[PDB]
Design a protein around this nucleic acid. Structure first.
Ligand SMILES: [K+]
Ligand SMILES: [Mg+2]
Ligand SMILES: [Mg+2]
Ligand SMILES: [Mg+2]
Ligand SMILES: [Mg+2]
Ligand SMILES: [Mg+2]
Ligand SMILES: [Mg+2]
Ligand SMILES: [Mg+2]
Ligand SMILES: [Mg+2]
Ligand SMILES: [Mg+2]
Ligand SMILES: [Mg+2]
Ligand SMILES: [Mg+2]
Ligand SMILES: [Mg+2]
Ligand SMILES: [Mg+2]
Ligand SMILES: [Mg+2]
Ligand SMILES: [Mg+2]
Ligand SMILES: [Mg+2]
Ligand SMILES: [Mg+2]
Ligand SMILES: [Mg+2]
Ligand SMILES: [Mg+2]
Ligand SMILES: [Mg+2]
Ligand SMILES: [Mg+2]
Ligand SMILES: [Mg+2]
Ligand SMILES: [Mg+2]
Ligand SMILES: [Mg+2]
Ligand SMILES: [Mg+2]
Ligand SMILES: [Mg+2]
Ligand SMILES: [Mg+2]
Ligand SMILES: [Mg+2]
Ligand SMILES: [Mg+2]
Ligand SMILES: [Mg+2]
Ligand SMILES: [Mg+2]
Ligand SMILES: [Mg+2]
Ligand SMILES: [Mg+2]
Ligand SMILES: [Mg+2]
Ligand SMILES: [Mg+2]
Ligand SMILES: [Mg+2]
Ligand SMILES: [Mg+2]
Ligand SMILES: [Mg+2]
Ligand SMILES: [Mg+2]
Lengths: 184, 258, 185
RNA sequence: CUCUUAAGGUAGCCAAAUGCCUCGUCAUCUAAUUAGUGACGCGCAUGAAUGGAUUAACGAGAUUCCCACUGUCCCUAUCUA
RNA sequence: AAGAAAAUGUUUU
RNA sequence: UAUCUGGUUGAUCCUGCCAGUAGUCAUAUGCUUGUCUCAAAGAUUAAGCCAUGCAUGUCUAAGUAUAAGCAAUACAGUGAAACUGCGAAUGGCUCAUUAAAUCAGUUAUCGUUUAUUUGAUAGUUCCCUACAUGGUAUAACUGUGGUAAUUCUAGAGCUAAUACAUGCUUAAAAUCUCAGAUGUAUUUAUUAGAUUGAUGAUUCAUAAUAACUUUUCGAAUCGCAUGGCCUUGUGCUGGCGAUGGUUCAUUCAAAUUUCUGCCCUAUCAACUUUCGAUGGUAGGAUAGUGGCCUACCAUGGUUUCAACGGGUAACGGGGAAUAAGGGUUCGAUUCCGGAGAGGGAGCCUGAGAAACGGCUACCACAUCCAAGGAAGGCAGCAGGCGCGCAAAUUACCCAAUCCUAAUUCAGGGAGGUAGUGACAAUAAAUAACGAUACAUGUAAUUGGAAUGAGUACAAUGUAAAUACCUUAACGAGGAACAAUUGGAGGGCAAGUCUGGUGCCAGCAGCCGCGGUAAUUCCAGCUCCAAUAGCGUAUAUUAAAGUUGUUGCAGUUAAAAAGCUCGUAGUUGAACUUUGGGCCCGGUUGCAACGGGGCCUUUCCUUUACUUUGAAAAAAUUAGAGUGUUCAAAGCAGGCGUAUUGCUCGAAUAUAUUAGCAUGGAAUAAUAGAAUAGGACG
RNA sequence: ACCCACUCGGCACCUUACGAGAAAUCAAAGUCUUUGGGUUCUGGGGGGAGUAUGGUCGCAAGGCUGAAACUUAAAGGAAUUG
RNA sequence: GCCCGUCGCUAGUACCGAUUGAAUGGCUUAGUGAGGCCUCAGGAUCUGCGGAGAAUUUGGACAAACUUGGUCAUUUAGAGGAACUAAAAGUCGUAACAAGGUUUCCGUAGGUGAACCUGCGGAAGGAUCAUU
């Protein structure tokens, strides 16, 4: 099948390498998962050593971490808006590491209200304690008014079968907004 | 080639086993186990070639399957079990124990020992690590892992292993002036005292050893086994005590019996 | 497969096949020591050349070198044990000066003659071949035996082999069986 | 060495748009070739500005083979003016 | 001052 | 083991090759072939084709037994079949591909996977079974069949599990969230891991926090002994194990990986790059690193210090032959590594295979058939055909060596045994000794001995044998129980002897011999050489200082470019701490030689080079010891006894490339402060 | 301009060769088996053959590069006596 | 004495050679493309709004294999052509070795049955180390 060997892929001098040692199983590759959105379907791949990988096809929900409050709520992926490696992945809504997605933002809304309760974008005195730390970035809170939070996929859905990620924040968030405004 | 090899051709076996060349095409391949392939002595070799109790491998298996032989306190009915350095092989019939130590020539010498010190064995600390749940442990040269080691035990130290509970009873530190066995290289089987340890970051550490006769040799840190202090080895040393007589004085010793 | 079995040649043929002086000297040695062919002389010359080469390689080292001392005294030990070398001349430079007749003398076939066990060197060879000579408690039928200078005193006829033993032989038995009738009864 | 009337066909080239015999012989091309091409050459009767040999390019010139292509044919049918 | 022509010889001893 | 000799001439000295000579575990072939030991053997050509048979199966006390199998109150022993588990990825064969590839030495994984072995390790699970769940289950078996045929299978009826699928009980202590949560496994994010463990070094080990899982593990398993307490009850506890299980470590491994090193070729000088070439970012894929692949980007990467291309009758190495030194040649092949199983490709299972005594396809061969179909892979062991100069039994056995399995028991063409066997190697029969006759010798004058070549009782040897070793008896007289192969001009040891032929026939490596007196042919006799061997052909090594680094030759023998320039390459003037002194101190026998330290204006960059040390598997090589009867070999063995056994060994050296550590600082190179942008404080 | 002496550089020459060489001869063709100052090119018995083939240059004639099969015991150098 | 070439005889070895020759293998362009694997589906019938799911099937990547064209490497047939070599006594002449009877030889060019001849420049390896 697909080989990851370097017996092909001619040497650095440009010389074409002669063949020996017909393709070996320990250097095989496999086909990309090409994870889609919605209607979860996870296939098990028996890998080397008896281990198991999870090709995630058509993933709907993933665990996304804010990393500013350390919450990591489970949410549903709206869609893909940016991909540094291939715009076609954005066009086909392919879920992949480092892909910029939109998450529902509703679990984060609920957690923020139940924890701090300060009308983010529209046991009694715990908010009195954690009120000074209730201010958040304008470019983060503005997304809640539309119900779509920008996030970056950090897991490998083709490898682990999960589509976990983190909410974009700070300089990373600003960078991806600038790219989105340039390409949209 | 497609998987692990199960055979060991003769002339490919370790030379220390002193196996006859024209006996068969194969040598006993040491099974996976505590010490190593090259650094071990299969029970079949120890029972047929070093002690001559069994005449062949069939009789070796007959010995082992009636639970006579015992390695490190456990029965070990495996014919090619890789008994290695400082293992205790006790036979209850012909009641006697041996400690697998290297003679001066580098072969695993037959070293008769008494029960009061066959009770334990020594182990060089291969590594010190934090196990799961934050539990420290020591990995010894014979593949033993012992939990909750003394927090002063570092790599290249030696630990006395109870061998009944498998715990640390005492521990010797790798330091200048401590007695060391050499467990590899050209000087395999030699006993001396550490003179200096050269660091060689990124490379291999070297150590200078002075035997009792003041012969000084340098060897890699990998094959130095601390066995105590000067004049006080924690184990019973073999007949030669690692002196490494030259061939001339060896001939003189041989011809002193006339 | 099993380990290979080492084997070596024990002789070396002369470079010049038809040297008249060498041929005459070889026939002289063969006649003097009852040798079957030139191959025995070739073998003795091969051993002597090996010994001389070893001695030269030892001498090329500085004296009191450990290897020179060890292998030298080993070589003199072996040579004086076989009898080829002289007790007086144990300095390895009188090993360099050895000759073929020194080895031809220490043969069992030569010693059986030199001890009076036989009436000719060829008679001695025949006696050894026909299982008549023992070294200790051991019949030896190999004419090239290299008596170890401790078996010289012990070379004697065998307990078997009815020349020093007690048996009546075979052709003597047949002769007696026919003479029983030949006498008239 | 000669003799017919001076010389006696050199270099080349060829069954050639020049060869009768002749559908020459050999090879090749084909299932099969009086065709083609390559050779051979005592050449009826080739041959040197009556120009010889060869030549890239060019040709509504003559010729053979191949690929494509097709109603030229197998085998004809139908439609329009 | 200088002085025409002169080719060839079998094989192995 | 530092050697030459014959051939150009009338003669000479050269150059120079031809020829001779010797070795080859180096092949073949001819003639011959008695003994003992050892044993290479279809590599070369055809990785050509293969009939037949065998080469992979496996069960313990301890997974599943109602065989309608055997045996003397559930089964209990043995146990075919089958299910389950494990193995079949080892071994064995071959050398076709392969030239920076493999391989060797040396590295790395802080870049990964790892059945097994060994060691450690799991009180946390529940949203009306645990004194133990289901068929969502079936094989074997019974019965009914199809097909010409395959290790083909259909339909029907049962029945289990350490198969499959589910599923509780272990409190206690314990901190967070607003009663629940907290084991482990997965994924992400975050925090600590200090200057509270480790490393030269880490985002390491490990822990903590918040969450997340088409659910990972957290024994519904098995054998043997039964004990203690006891409300003596279907009580509570409790032993040694087997098997299985998560993670870690270990071991057997694997995969990638650093540095340096390959034969010939320029009648290969540019190559790679669109279709990945070199690098960057992201992703995917992988066990994991990586252009391994994808997208965008940059235009890189290699090369006269030989890239790239081509050849190899090239698998690499350990090694082999020959060798004064330096070298030349060989290495299919006993060990190690690689690769392949007719050619390719693809893949399943599995820890591990891109497996071929696994499957799928195409290609090429090729087999049965009842024509419908079906089935293949000897470069395993034999064996056959073919090819060729060129290579053996369709034998016996697991007894040894080891391997596999559930495993002391079974299996193993792995392996061993024998057969064939002048591959090669070791040892060494074919006679020895008297008496008569003559000159130590002589001959068909004779005698007494000796014995193995065989043959064979037995015994031993063997797994059963054969053979060797040992022996009853037999078994020498031209000892016919009869040694050959090449030669007799020179090289080169040995005939001016006889017959034959007559430049014929033939010989002759070379020079030559033969033309009617042949030392050379064909023979007889005789002699020589080696001898159970000897000759021939081919290749190769020494000879060859005829490949020359050591170490050739170039005026005329072959060879100085017509001449000069010139890049690469090679090479390149001299100079920088020398010399006094005071000591301590090792080796040889006060002297010599080595070493270290103090002053004396001094104190203790980058290389090459050289010393020393660890390293460079074993076998092989040198080499120590050791009476295999000697020897080649082998690593044995030795010591006195009537033991209830004592003991020495299986050393030592070597690969001088590359890497690592280390002393030296001569030699050779390199760099400094010049527009001072210099040094020190 | 010439004469004498000296000197550097040059074309050469004469004598002897310590030395070299097979010799002819050579002040280099010496300082080479007591074999190493640096460096380039070329040869490896005679033919086939400077041929075939490929490449390249040339208008051509040809030049440069350049084999092998096969064949052969000499070919050749210098000198000596005829 | 020795000797050179053409031309005759015989034999052998390479070379050239029409056949848009042939074959094999590697690499490669453009096409077709089995098969397994992943994937979009599909749903016999075995099941208790769910599950397992065979045939079938989408798109992929890996690609055997074949065709075409190119290139290289290796081998190989071929009418015919043209050389070379060898071989006891062939023909023609006599080119060279002597001043070889025209000194020889080199380079070049032309001629010519054949060796060779001739022109121009060169060498002495010449038949001259020489005319203050
Ligand atoms: K003649
Ligand atoms: Mg490997
Ligand atoms: Mg004409
Ligand atoms: Mg015509
Ligand atoms: Mg024509
Ligand atoms: Mg036509
Ligand atoms: Mg005219
Ligand atoms: Mg005309
Ligand atoms: Mg026109
Ligand atoms: Mg004549
Ligand atoms: Mg020769
Ligand atoms: Mg016998
Ligand atoms: Mg073959
Ligand atoms: Mg294998
Ligand atoms: Mg970590
Ligand atoms: Mg990446
Ligand atoms: Mg090779
Ligand atoms: Mg090959
Ligand atoms: Mg090999
Ligand atoms: Mg081969
Ligand atoms: Mg192998
Ligand atoms: Mg394979
Ligand atoms: Mg085959
Ligand atoms: Mg395969
Ligand atoms: Mg097979
Ligand atoms: Mg196999
Ligand atoms: Mg005989
Ligand atoms: Mg004769
Ligand atoms: Mg003679
Ligand atoms: Mg020469
Ligand atoms: Mg010349
Ligand atoms: Mg010149
Ligand atoms: Mg230069
Ligand atoms: Mg200098
Ligand atoms: Mg030549
Ligand atoms: Mg002359
Ligand atoms: Mg003339
Ligand atoms: Mg003339
Ligand atoms: Mg004339
Ligand atoms: Mg000349």
């Amino acid at each position: 099948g697909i080989s990851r060997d370097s017996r092909h892929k001619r040497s650095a001098t440009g010389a074409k390498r002669a063949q020996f040692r017909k393709k070996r199983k320990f250097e095989l590759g496999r086909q990309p998962a090409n994870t889609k959105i919605g209607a979860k379907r996870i296939h098990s791949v028996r890998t080397r050593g008896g281990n198991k990988k999870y090709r995630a096809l058509r993933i709907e929900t993933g665990n996304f971490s804010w990393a500013s409050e350390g919450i990591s709520k489970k949410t549903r992926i709206a869609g893909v808006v940016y991909h540094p490696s291939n715009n076609e992945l954005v066009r086909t809504n392919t879920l992949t590491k480092a892909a910029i997605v939109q998450i529902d933002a509703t679990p984060f809304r609920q957690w923020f209200e139940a924890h701090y309760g300060q009308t983010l974008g529209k046991a009694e005195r715990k908010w009195a304690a954690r009120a000074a730390s209730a201010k958040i970035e304008s470019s983060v809170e503005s997304q809640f008014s539309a119900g779509r939070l920008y996030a970056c996929i950090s897991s490998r859905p083709g490898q682990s079968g999960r589509c976990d990620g983190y909410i974009l924040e700070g300089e990373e968030l600003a960078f991806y907004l600038r790219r989105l405004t340039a390409k949209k | 080639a497609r998987g692990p090899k199960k055979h060991l051709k003769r002339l490919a076996a370790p030379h220390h086993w002193l196996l006859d060349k024209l006996s068969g095409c194969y040598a006993p391949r040491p099974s996976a186990g505590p010490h190593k392939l090259r650094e071990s002595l299969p029970l079949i070799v120890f029972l047929r070639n070093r002690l001559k109790y069994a005449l062949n491998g069939r009789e070796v298996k007959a010995i082992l399957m009636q639970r006579h032989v015992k390695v490190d306190g456990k029965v070990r009915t495996d014919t090619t079990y890789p008994a290695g350095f400082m293992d205790v092989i006790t036979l209850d019939a012909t009641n006697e124990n041996f400690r697998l130590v290297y003679d001066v020539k580098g072969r695993f010498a037959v070293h008769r020992i008494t029960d009061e010190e066959a009770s334990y064995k020594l182990g060089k600390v291969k590594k010190v690590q934090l196990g799961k749940k934050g539990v420290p442990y020591v990995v010894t040269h014979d593949g033993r892992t012992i939990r909750y080691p003394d927090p002063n035990i570092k790599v290249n130290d030696t630990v006395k292993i109870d061998l009944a509970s498998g715990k640390i009873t005492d521990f010797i530190k790798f330091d200048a002036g401590k007695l060391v066995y050499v467990t590899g290289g050209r000087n395999l089987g030699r006993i001396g005292t550490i003179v200096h340890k050269e660091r060689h970051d990124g490379g291999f550490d070297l150590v200078h050893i002075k035997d009792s006769l003041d012969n000084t040799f340098v060897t890699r840190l990998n094959n130095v086994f601390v066995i105590g202090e000067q004049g006080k080895p924690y184990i019973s040393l073999p007949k030669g005590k690692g002196i490494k007589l030259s061939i001339a004085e060896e001939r003189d010793r041989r011809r002193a019996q006339q | 497969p099993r380990a290979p079995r080492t084997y070596s040649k024990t002789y070396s043929t002369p470079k010049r096949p038809y040297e008249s002086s060498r041929l005459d000297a070889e026939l002289k040695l063969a006649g003097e020591f009852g040798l079957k062919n030139k191959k025995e002389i070739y073998r003795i010359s091969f051993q002597l050349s090996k010994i001389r080469r070893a001695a030269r390689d030892l001498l090329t080292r500085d004296e009191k070198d450990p290897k020179r001392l060890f292998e030298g005294n080993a070589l003199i030990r072996r040579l004086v044990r076989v009898g080829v070398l002289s007790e007086d001349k144990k300095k390895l430079d009188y090993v360099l000066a050895l000759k073929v007749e020194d080895f031809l003398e220490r043969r069992l076939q030569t010693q059986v003659y030199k001890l009076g066990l036989a009436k000719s060197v060829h008679h001695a060879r025949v006696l050894i071949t026909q299982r008549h000579i023992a070294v200790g408690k051991q019949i030896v039928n190999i004419p090239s035996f290299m008596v170890r200078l401790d078996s010289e005193k012990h070379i004697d006829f065998a307990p078997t082999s009815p020349f020093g033993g007690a048996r009546p032989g075979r052709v003597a038995r047949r002769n007696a069986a026919r003479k029983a009738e030949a006498s008239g009864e």
